[PDB]
Amino acid sequence: SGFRKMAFPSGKVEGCMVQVTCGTTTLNGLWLDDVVYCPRHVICTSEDMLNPNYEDLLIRKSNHNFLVQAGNVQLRVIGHSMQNCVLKLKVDTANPKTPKYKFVRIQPGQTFSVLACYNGSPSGVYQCAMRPNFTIKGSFLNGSCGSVGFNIDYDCVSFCYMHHMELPTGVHAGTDLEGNFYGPFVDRQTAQAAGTDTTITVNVLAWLYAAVINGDRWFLNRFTTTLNDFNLVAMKYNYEPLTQDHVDILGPLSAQTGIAVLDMCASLKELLQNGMNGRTILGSALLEDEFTPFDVVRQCSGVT
Amino acid sequence: SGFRKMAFPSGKVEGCMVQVTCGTTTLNGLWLDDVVYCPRHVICTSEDMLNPNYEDLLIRKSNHNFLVQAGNVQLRVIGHSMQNCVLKLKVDTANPKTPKYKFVRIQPGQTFSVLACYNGSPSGVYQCAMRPNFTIKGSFLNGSCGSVGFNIDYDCVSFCYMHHMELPTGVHAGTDLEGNFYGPFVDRQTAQAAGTDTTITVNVLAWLYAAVINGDRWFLNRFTTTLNDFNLVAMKYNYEPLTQDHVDILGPLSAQTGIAVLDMCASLKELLQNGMNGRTILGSALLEDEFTPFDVVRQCSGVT
Ligand SMILES: *[C@]1(O)C(=O)Nc2c(C(=O)OC)cc(Br)cc21
Ligand SMILES: *[C@]1(O)C(=O)Nc2c(C(=O)OC)cc(Br)cc21
């Protein structure tokens, strides 16, 4: 029993973190095989970030200008290239700690773990979700750029995020491991505002199923609803519209608890309309939306 | 910016997890140097757990009955001993991945990370606090026993908790790495109820300082209070009494924000008396008490 915001074990990713310095800018890099992946703004001075022309800035850079340090040992850079908003630094040594890995571009609503790093050294690990407005609500200070987001399937690490920026509103933006930003964000020190941060409806329902499995059942009511009726309520409360695909993915949780998905939708509907009334669900006074149905199943079964 | 429930990077502890089987009971062990630490109830059948005499049960056990597996390789057990509620299995091979470590018995209010494991394999990592009633609110399924709680200082892992039991109320009890239970709990399948779960006042104040540092300031009021007046309010709301030691530890946060500790106590006092009124602080609708003043400073500075 017990339900926690759990991150994947970080060891496999800790063994990939390196420090990358270019001129006077230092950030984190991800060392996989003989390549180090890092944000391309490593080549910028804070002054260049106001309006950078990365291709032009990169012309003035040679392999020897990119200092890559893994622990206290220096890696030799033998090639460099820009792929979208990331730099790929070919080093002469393959990372002996390279795990089995994939690069995946996740969809909003999907969750992942972040290994926050400073100077190639890990500080902590926490669980995030790609918000529907393509930002993440992380915890990143200066020096954290290049810290990565990932998921793990048995022994394979699927890297999904690389940290690049903090918007003026304290929220975070970044790319997948191909250098493509999630959302409309650009690696530039300019006014970039996020869109509406809607609640990930499928995740709240999954978390309500986790609450039932763990004993919290006060919110279960005698009602049911339809997808269209539920969605009218979800629109009013800035919740993502629920689709039949979302219903299908909640199937195993519905089967385990014996509570039909549309009945849980009705419970969620009353929670939105009436509030918690000072009560809690899994030690939270708000509806948690950063557990996918897959995360609930994983945590409630014991997948390692 | 951004403030998250962050766990320490788990790699150093992942390299210590092993599986321990005795008869038909399998749980997790912690392999440090040439010793494997595990709950002594590994020698029990679920039937023995109703009323075990561990010394008597242990007489029927030899070194060869304790099967220790690290990954897919078997460790040879050359000695075994019972220290309080833990078994120490001397193996013939020192763990090559042993980090620098200490065994510490933490006080209630202190936080730590848990690497939840199943069959010697890590599933996830999350941040806990030793509650004032000596329980932890974890996430543990059958097979999770022997999973450990720890803190990290640069390269030294201070192991503080080993998971042993789930009380009938869904809360968790366990020992330090010397086998001494936190609280009055015993490793027996019997009715054990927890005491009052009070709120860790010093941690809530530290979290309010983290909120101010990260932009959430609506709860700051024009009032102040005294330790005695604040404590009258804290008693009513089942909050731990605040001492001058707690005030001293909040000193760096007070210095950084320019908000005197007693002024923050007055803000907390009004939050207790009036509630949040539907508002949030660091994305929470309740007062978080699982960040120590040390955790707030660590996260807000970038300690690796
Ligand atoms: C990341 O590269 C990082 O590590 N720091 C940083 C800053 C910074 O330090 O600003 C003063 C700014 C940006 Br746009 C990105 C990053
Ligand atoms: C831990 O040793 C564990 O891993 N499982 C377990 C059980 C259990 O499986 O009960 C059916 C019970 C206890 Br008291 C402790 C533990």
XYZ file of C-alpha atoms and ligand atoms in Angstrom:
640
model
C 0.000 0.000 0.000
C 0.919 3.702 -0.228
C 1.131 5.814 -3.380
C 4.079 8.150 -4.059
C 5.348 10.531 -6.761
C 8.110 8.176 -7.772
C 10.978 8.729 -10.143
C 12.846 5.953 -11.996
C 16.164 4.836 -10.350
C 18.710 7.328 -11.777
C 21.988 5.330 -11.808
C 21.851 4.508 -15.535
C 21.608 8.256 -16.355
C 24.130 9.399 -13.665
C 26.787 7.395 -15.557
C 26.084 9.531 -18.678
C 26.303 13.009 -17.173
C 29.269 15.135 -18.167
C 30.211 18.828 -17.932
C 30.521 20.841 -21.150
C 32.294 24.242 -21.217
C 32.582 26.505 -24.211
C 34.362 29.798 -23.517
C 32.814 30.951 -20.233
C 29.492 29.020 -20.472
C 29.264 25.735 -18.591
C 26.314 23.342 -18.693
C 25.560 19.567 -18.653
C 26.032 17.080 -21.481
C 24.718 13.554 -21.994
C 27.456 11.091 -22.976
C 26.102 8.077 -24.946
C 28.516 5.888 -26.933
C 31.128 8.307 -28.439
C 28.782 11.323 -28.577
C 28.067 14.069 -26.005
C 24.621 15.767 -26.432
C 24.215 19.277 -24.979
C 22.132 22.484 -25.596
C 23.601 24.501 -28.485
C 23.383 27.680 -26.333
C 26.650 26.404 -24.669
C 28.331 28.536 -27.429
C 26.543 31.717 -26.264
C 27.529 34.441 -23.865
C 24.428 35.804 -21.941
C 24.778 38.791 -24.383
C 24.638 36.490 -27.472
C 21.387 34.929 -26.042
C 19.413 38.144 -26.687
C 19.508 37.493 -30.435
C 21.747 34.508 -31.387
C 22.576 33.313 -34.901
C 23.751 29.849 -33.915
C 25.204 28.951 -37.346
C 27.315 32.150 -37.291
C 28.365 31.686 -33.639
C 29.338 28.060 -34.378
C 31.716 29.068 -37.228
C 34.007 30.678 -34.616
C 34.131 27.339 -32.681
C 36.535 24.448 -33.168
C 36.624 20.938 -31.557
C 39.230 22.177 -29.029
C 36.912 24.971 -27.773
C 34.435 22.413 -26.347
C 35.829 21.186 -23.044
C 34.080 17.950 -21.977
C 34.814 16.581 -18.520
C 33.490 13.219 -17.195
C 34.184 13.158 -13.451
C 37.686 14.650 -13.218
C 38.877 13.309 -16.601
C 38.903 15.226 -19.850
C 37.379 13.811 -23.036
C 39.001 14.536 -26.397
C 36.559 16.149 -28.872
C 37.160 14.929 -32.458
C 33.987 16.273 -34.151
C 31.073 18.655 -33.568
C 27.743 19.279 -35.247
C 24.519 21.128 -34.679
C 21.274 19.115 -34.892
C 18.355 21.520 -34.374
C 18.910 23.065 -30.817
C 21.459 20.459 -29.608
C 25.182 20.023 -30.238
C 26.599 16.572 -30.804
C 30.241 16.392 -29.696
C 31.979 13.360 -31.109
C 34.517 12.252 -28.499
C 37.364 9.723 -29.023
C 36.135 7.437 -26.195
C 32.852 5.548 -25.997
C 31.166 5.929 -22.574
C 31.819 2.608 -20.826
C 28.674 3.190 -18.719
C 26.378 3.662 -21.772
C 23.072 1.911 -20.971
C 20.669 0.496 -23.617
C 18.925 3.627 -24.860
C 16.466 5.230 -27.224
C 15.568 8.836 -28.006
C 11.796 9.388 -27.786
C 9.693 12.474 -28.363
C 6.889 12.209 -25.805
C 3.350 13.588 -26.071
C 1.850 16.062 -23.510
C 0.350 14.193 -20.552
C 3.264 11.714 -20.518
C 5.422 11.655 -17.408
C 9.184 11.205 -16.978
C 11.983 11.551 -14.455
C 14.510 14.407 -14.429
C 18.043 14.035 -13.097
C 18.822 17.669 -12.199
C 22.575 18.224 -12.685
C 25.135 20.986 -12.068
C 28.671 20.891 -13.635
C 28.078 17.314 -14.906
C 27.222 16.220 -11.330
C 23.754 14.987 -10.302
C 21.941 16.799 -7.487
C 18.519 15.150 -7.433
C 15.811 13.196 -9.184
C 12.112 14.002 -9.497
C 9.059 13.064 -11.576
C 7.623 15.532 -14.182
C 4.904 15.527 -16.839
C 5.038 17.226 -20.232
C 2.222 19.778 -19.693
C -0.454 20.250 -22.416
C 1.124 23.707 -23.139
C 4.546 21.942 -23.716
C 6.276 23.286 -20.651
C 7.396 21.269 -17.614
C 7.193 22.400 -14.009
C 10.674 21.462 -12.911
C 13.235 22.692 -10.442
C 16.209 24.098 -12.351
C 18.815 26.688 -11.336
C 21.597 28.236 -13.522
C 23.996 25.466 -14.528
C 21.105 22.884 -14.860
C 20.814 23.122 -18.656
C 21.552 19.844 -20.343
C 19.919 17.878 -17.462
C 17.767 15.162 -19.088
C 14.285 13.687 -18.742
C 13.881 9.937 -19.223
C 11.756 6.815 -18.761
C 13.134 3.276 -18.137
C 11.786 -0.056 -19.480
C 13.666 -2.859 -17.614
C 17.239 -2.043 -18.847
C 16.488 0.471 -21.655
C 16.560 4.222 -20.926
C 14.297 6.247 -23.258
C 15.626 9.823 -23.128
C 12.799 12.264 -23.843
C 13.844 15.687 -22.571
C 16.862 17.957 -22.371
C 16.560 21.140 -20.320
C 17.219 24.431 -22.152
C 15.292 27.386 -20.672
C 13.288 28.966 -17.881
C 10.428 31.183 -19.086
C 9.824 34.485 -17.222
C 6.870 32.745 -15.478
C 9.128 30.219 -13.672
C 8.139 27.296 -15.927
C 10.585 25.242 -17.986
C 11.107 24.609 -21.702
C 13.385 22.238 -23.540
C 13.921 19.785 -26.337
C 13.799 16.064 -27.144
C 17.293 14.430 -27.743
C 17.092 15.411 -31.456
C 17.172 19.124 -30.451
C 13.536 19.873 -31.309
C 11.822 21.971 -28.668
C 8.605 20.764 -27.135
C 6.091 23.483 -27.969
C 6.743 26.788 -29.707
C 9.711 27.808 -27.559
C 12.993 29.046 -29.035
C 16.456 29.091 -27.383
C 16.521 32.890 -27.121
C 16.350 35.359 -24.162
C 13.049 36.870 -25.318
C 9.425 37.142 -24.093
C 7.896 33.725 -24.498
C 4.625 33.111 -22.718
C 3.071 29.695 -22.168
C -0.449 28.785 -23.284
C -3.197 27.529 -20.928
C -1.963 24.923 -18.505
C -4.848 22.495 -18.651
C -5.216 19.491 -16.336
C -4.344 16.066 -17.821
C -7.767 14.419 -17.341
C -6.663 10.816 -18.107
C -3.920 11.134 -15.444
C -6.321 12.459 -12.774
C -8.659 9.456 -13.436
C -5.670 7.064 -13.205
C -4.708 8.711 -9.861
C -8.322 8.335 -8.630
C -8.028 4.587 -9.509
C -4.712 4.498 -7.505
C -6.533 6.123 -4.580
C -9.267 3.456 -4.655
C -6.643 0.648 -4.791
C -4.926 2.247 -1.756
C -8.048 2.751 0.403
C -9.169 6.336 -0.287
C -12.766 5.879 -1.491
C -14.808 8.774 0.036
C -15.098 10.446 -3.371
C -16.852 7.457 -4.996
C -20.442 8.420 -5.718
C -23.673 6.740 -6.931
C -23.504 8.475 -10.345
C -22.259 7.870 -13.857
C -21.943 10.103 -16.944
C -21.253 9.976 -20.715
C -18.054 11.107 -22.496
C -19.900 14.135 -23.951
C -21.486 15.161 -20.619
C -18.183 14.663 -18.776
C -16.351 16.729 -21.440
C -18.752 19.682 -20.981
C -17.654 19.738 -17.300
C -13.976 19.201 -18.265
C -14.088 22.219 -20.645
C -15.428 24.499 -17.873
C -12.628 23.460 -15.498
C -9.761 23.681 -18.081
C -9.337 19.905 -18.146
C -8.206 18.072 -21.321
C -11.121 16.513 -23.282
C -11.396 12.775 -22.543
C -11.390 10.517 -25.618
C -12.262 6.815 -26.109
C -8.465 6.173 -26.371
C -8.121 7.538 -22.813
C -11.030 5.256 -21.710
C -9.293 2.221 -23.357
C -5.991 2.991 -21.550
C -7.906 3.192 -18.195
C -9.335 -0.323 -18.914
C -6.910 -2.339 -16.703
C -7.528 0.039 -13.764
C -11.299 -0.232 -14.304
C -10.967 -4.051 -14.460
C -8.881 -4.228 -11.279
C -11.164 -1.995 -9.181
C -14.488 -3.024 -10.723
C -15.286 0.684 -11.263
C -16.356 1.508 -14.863
C -14.403 4.438 -16.392
C -17.537 6.551 -16.885
C -18.480 6.020 -13.205
C -15.027 7.380 -12.193
C -15.623 10.278 -14.644
C -18.824 11.066 -12.666
C -16.851 11.022 -9.402
C -14.286 13.395 -10.974
C -17.199 15.551 -12.236
C -18.598 15.921 -8.679
C -15.067 16.608 -7.315
C -14.724 19.416 -9.872
C -18.205 20.800 -9.159
C -18.101 20.526 -5.333
C -14.401 20.548 -4.440
C -12.648 18.416 -1.804
C -14.507 20.175 1.137
C -11.285 20.195 3.187
C -10.657 16.479 2.526
C -7.617 14.746 0.958
C -6.982 11.924 -1.580
C -3.587 10.133 -1.305
C -2.360 12.960 0.969
C -3.200 15.626 -1.638
C -5.799 18.470 -1.370
C -5.893 18.904 -5.175
C -6.448 16.477 -8.056
C -3.015 15.114 -9.083
C -2.429 14.906 -12.836
C 1.213 13.747 -13.045
C 0.654 9.962 -12.901
C -0.213 8.275 -16.210
C -2.413 5.098 -16.203
C 0.879 3.241 -16.982
C 2.575 4.788 -13.899
C -0.356 3.751 -11.681
C -0.240 0.135 -12.968
C 3.597 0.051 -12.673
C 3.589 1.337 -9.078
C 0.664 -0.825 -7.986
C 2.231 -4.083 -9.389
C 5.958 -3.718 -8.609
C 7.608 -3.426 -12.062
C 11.425 -3.113 -11.793
C 13.210 28.603 -10.113
C 10.704 25.813 -9.378
C 10.500 23.696 -6.228
C 10.096 19.898 -6.364
C 9.894 16.903 -4.002
C 13.329 15.696 -4.973
C 15.078 12.487 -4.080
C 18.873 12.007 -4.038
C 20.348 10.369 -7.218
C 19.992 6.618 -6.492
C 22.907 5.056 -8.441
C 25.177 4.651 -5.397
C 22.439 2.617 -3.623
C 21.319 0.668 -6.762
C 24.823 -0.871 -6.841
C 24.224 -2.258 -3.303
C 20.848 -3.921 -3.798
C 20.760 -7.701 -3.725
C 18.064 -10.386 -3.399
C 18.008 -12.545 -0.261
C 16.011 -15.817 -0.123
C 15.645 -18.036 2.895
C 13.397 -21.059 2.351
C 10.393 -19.596 0.523
C 10.734 -15.951 1.716
C 12.441 -13.516 -0.638
C 13.239 -9.885 0.152
C 15.952 -7.236 -0.514
C 19.397 -7.002 1.061
C 21.936 -4.180 1.182
C 25.435 -5.303 0.169
C 28.197 -3.099 1.688
C 31.797 -4.367 1.752
C 31.562 -8.153 2.497
C 28.274 -7.930 4.437
C 24.639 -8.175 3.257
C 22.103 -6.434 5.597
C 18.477 -7.626 5.434
C 15.355 -7.839 7.717
C 15.608 -10.846 10.055
C 12.010 -11.831 9.124
C 13.583 -13.339 5.911
C 13.770 -16.545 8.073
C 9.989 -16.524 8.689
C 7.122 -18.166 6.893
C 3.942 -15.918 6.978
C 2.774 -18.434 9.681
C 5.944 -17.876 11.801
C 5.272 -14.059 11.627
C 2.199 -14.372 13.885
C 4.432 -15.060 16.890
C 8.139 -15.493 15.939
C 10.995 -16.417 18.274
C 13.800 -15.241 16.015
C 16.627 -16.804 18.077
C 14.871 -20.208 17.908
C 14.028 -19.862 14.190
C 17.653 -18.880 13.458
C 19.058 -22.063 15.098
C 17.507 -24.098 12.249
C 19.371 -21.902 9.678
C 22.860 -22.399 8.280
C 24.992 -20.167 5.958
C 23.901 -22.276 2.945
C 20.181 -21.599 3.621
C 20.616 -17.867 2.849
C 20.677 -17.477 -0.920
C 22.106 -14.056 -1.885
C 21.951 -13.021 -5.527
C 23.534 -9.807 -6.934
C 22.186 -9.370 -10.469
C 22.270 -12.925 -11.850
C 25.328 -14.026 -9.826
C 25.251 -15.914 -6.560
C 27.206 -14.747 -3.512
C 28.766 -17.302 -1.170
C 27.611 -16.846 2.456
C 30.429 -17.592 4.948
C 28.850 -16.204 8.162
C 25.526 -14.998 9.575
C 24.456 -13.094 12.661
C 21.443 -11.356 14.088
C 21.869 -7.723 15.202
C 18.553 -6.543 16.679
C 15.945 -6.907 13.779
C 18.505 -7.238 10.936
C 20.609 -10.154 9.702
C 24.192 -9.576 8.668
C 25.283 -12.118 6.046
C 29.035 -12.243 5.703
C 29.764 -13.012 2.048
C 33.154 -14.070 0.577
C 33.239 -11.126 -1.885
C 33.367 -7.423 -1.075
C 30.866 -5.397 -3.158
C 33.009 -3.683 -5.801
C 30.356 -0.932 -6.052
C 30.432 -0.128 -2.290
C 30.171 3.674 -1.949
C 31.537 5.686 1.029
C 28.890 5.080 3.676
C 27.685 5.583 7.212
C 24.785 4.160 9.210
C 22.751 6.946 10.847
C 19.700 6.825 13.072
C 17.661 9.874 12.064
C 15.273 11.903 14.226
C 11.550 12.431 13.336
C 11.135 15.401 10.990
C 14.263 14.406 9.024
C 13.776 13.504 5.380
C 15.434 10.839 3.215
C 15.137 9.053 -0.108
C 13.834 5.495 -0.526
C 14.936 3.202 -3.340
C 11.926 0.850 -3.525
C 13.183 -2.586 -4.642
C 11.704 -5.970 -5.605
C 13.880 -9.158 -5.865
C 17.084 -7.082 -5.429
C 16.026 -4.888 -8.393
C 15.184 -1.177 -8.041
C 11.755 0.025 -9.180
C 11.700 3.673 -8.122
C 12.978 6.449 -5.913
C 11.008 8.904 -3.786
C 11.480 11.325 -0.882
C 10.095 10.479 2.627
C 10.209 11.981 6.117
C 10.414 10.087 9.401
C 7.011 11.111 10.852
C 6.789 12.306 14.502
C 4.961 8.991 15.305
C 7.990 7.048 13.818
C 6.227 5.723 10.764
C 6.933 6.690 7.143
C 4.336 7.169 4.433
C 5.976 5.162 1.697
C 4.900 3.079 -1.247
C 5.801 -0.555 -0.578
C 4.301 -3.781 -1.947
C 5.136 -7.408 -0.917
C 8.757 -8.099 -1.837
C 9.834 -4.474 -0.924
C 11.222 -5.344 2.520
C 14.898 -4.604 2.795
C 14.543 -1.494 0.550
C 16.597 1.278 2.207
C 16.248 4.955 3.087
C 19.313 7.176 2.716
C 20.771 10.681 2.468
C 23.878 11.642 0.410
C 26.617 14.173 1.307
C 28.777 14.654 -1.851
C 30.087 11.030 -2.180
C 29.026 9.558 1.207
C 25.719 7.667 1.513
C 24.240 7.794 5.042
C 21.838 4.834 5.256
C 19.080 5.605 7.758
C 16.178 3.249 7.079
C 15.462 -0.343 6.143
C 11.872 -1.290 5.338
C 10.310 -4.061 7.459
C 6.516 -3.726 7.809
C 3.208 -2.253 6.716
C 0.835 -1.461 9.596
C -2.887 -2.277 9.115
C -3.438 1.479 8.493
C -1.323 1.491 5.288
C 1.638 3.281 6.913
C 5.174 1.895 7.057
C 7.548 0.863 9.847
C 11.173 -0.159 9.796
C 14.601 0.013 11.325
C 17.900 1.908 11.116
C 20.862 -0.169 9.650
C 21.652 -1.490 13.174
C 18.256 -3.296 13.230
C 16.599 -1.002 15.782
C 13.058 -0.078 14.821
C 12.068 3.547 14.634
C 9.264 3.886 17.169
C 7.646 1.137 19.217
C 7.043 -1.243 16.312
C 8.007 -4.923 16.429
C 8.604 -7.302 13.479
C 5.464 -9.333 14.201
C 2.094 -9.766 12.375
C 0.091 -8.227 15.228
C -2.108 -5.151 15.865
C 0.209 -2.188 16.018
C -1.388 1.225 15.795
C 0.494 4.453 15.141
C 0.329 7.482 17.436
C -0.802 10.968 16.321
C 0.695 12.003 13.023
C 1.567 15.589 13.814
C 2.799 18.097 11.222
C 6.555 18.860 11.226
C 6.308 22.618 11.920
C 9.978 23.475 11.159
C 9.619 21.787 7.733
C 6.414 23.685 6.857
C 8.194 27.010 7.697
C 11.194 25.958 5.551
C 8.760 25.157 2.678
C 7.081 28.576 3.140
C 10.597 30.134 2.800
C 11.087 28.035 -0.421
C 7.755 29.372 -1.699
C 8.847 32.983 -1.098
C 12.200 32.355 -2.874
C 10.241 30.894 -5.832
C 7.637 33.683 -6.159
C 4.625 32.475 -4.146
C 4.105 35.298 -1.625
C 0.292 35.769 -1.279
C 0.357 34.227 2.199
C 2.787 36.827 3.609
C 0.916 39.004 6.078
C 1.527 42.190 8.129
C 1.726 40.244 11.425
C 4.272 38.670 13.724
C 3.984 36.420 16.802
C 6.043 34.966 19.694
C 7.196 31.333 20.082
C 4.685 30.811 22.931
C 1.746 32.386 21.046
C 2.630 30.476 17.864
C 2.887 27.210 19.860
C -0.638 27.664 21.297
C -1.892 27.698 17.666
C 0.425 24.788 16.713
C -0.977 22.641 19.577
C -4.575 23.200 18.385
C -3.694 22.122 14.833
C -1.583 19.039 15.823
C 1.643 20.716 14.720
C 4.980 19.980 16.466
C 5.952 22.656 19.048
C 8.514 25.080 17.578
C 11.701 25.501 19.632
C 14.546 28.069 19.491
C 16.681 25.301 17.856
C 14.133 25.203 15.003
C 14.321 29.050 14.770
C 18.179 28.867 14.627
C 18.061 26.267 11.801
C 15.644 28.556 9.832
C 18.220 31.412 10.185
C 19.810 31.119 6.689
C 16.345 31.089 5.056
C 15.311 34.123 7.133
C 18.577 35.873 6.139
C 18.124 35.111 2.434
C 14.491 36.279 2.230
C 14.691 39.105 4.771
C 11.641 37.609 6.542
C 12.163 37.101 10.317
C 11.268 33.562 11.508
C 8.552 34.812 13.873
C 6.961 36.800 11.003
C 6.784 33.556 8.943
C 5.318 31.844 12.054
C 2.535 34.497 11.990
C 1.894 33.776 8.300
C 1.706 30.035 9.111
C -0.612 30.888 12.047
C -3.052 32.724 9.717
C -2.815 29.871 7.148
C -3.791 27.426 9.908
C -6.597 29.658 11.207
C -8.045 30.704 7.810
C -6.996 27.952 5.398
C -5.769 28.370 1.808
C -9.229 29.670 0.570
C -8.886 27.599 -2.621
C -5.360 28.928 -3.289
C -2.066 27.019 -3.748
C 1.583 27.378 -2.580
C 4.241 25.689 -4.791
C 1.443 23.765 -6.563
C 0.135 22.334 -3.268
C -3.296 22.957 -1.608
C -1.981 21.821 1.807
C 1.032 22.835 3.902
C 3.943 20.550 2.899
C 6.018 19.228 5.801
C 8.483 16.876 4.056
C 11.234 19.400 3.210
C 13.723 20.155 6.001
C 15.399 23.633 6.162
C 18.540 21.792 4.883
C 16.593 20.389 1.880
C 15.275 23.869 1.021
C 18.797 25.394 1.144
C 20.251 22.435 -0.843
C 17.611 22.672 -3.591
C 17.701 26.464 -3.776
C 21.562 26.601 -4.110
C 22.396 23.613 -6.349
C 24.356 21.245 -4.051
C 25.495 18.083 -5.905
C 21.433 27.067 -19.111
O 22.358 26.912 -20.178
C 22.238 27.169 -17.827
O 22.838 26.244 -17.297
N 22.224 28.456 -17.407
C 21.450 29.246 -18.236
C 21.184 30.627 -18.184
C 21.802 31.551 -17.194
O 22.673 31.234 -16.422
O 21.288 32.783 -17.275
C 21.888 33.790 -16.424
C 20.328 31.188 -19.135
C 19.776 30.382 -20.114
Br 18.730 31.180 -21.479
C 20.021 29.027 -20.169
C 20.878 28.461 -19.234
C 8.504 -8.082 3.646
O 9.471 -9.014 4.108
C 8.168 -8.453 2.213
O 8.911 -8.300 1.253
N 6.942 -9.027 2.189
C 6.372 -9.045 3.448
C 5.135 -9.562 3.877
C 4.196 -10.301 2.990
O 4.451 -10.631 1.858
O 3.041 -10.573 3.605
C 2.090 -11.378 2.866
C 4.771 -9.421 5.218
C 5.636 -8.795 6.097
Br 5.191 -8.736 7.939
C 6.846 -8.276 5.687
C 7.221 -8.419 4.358
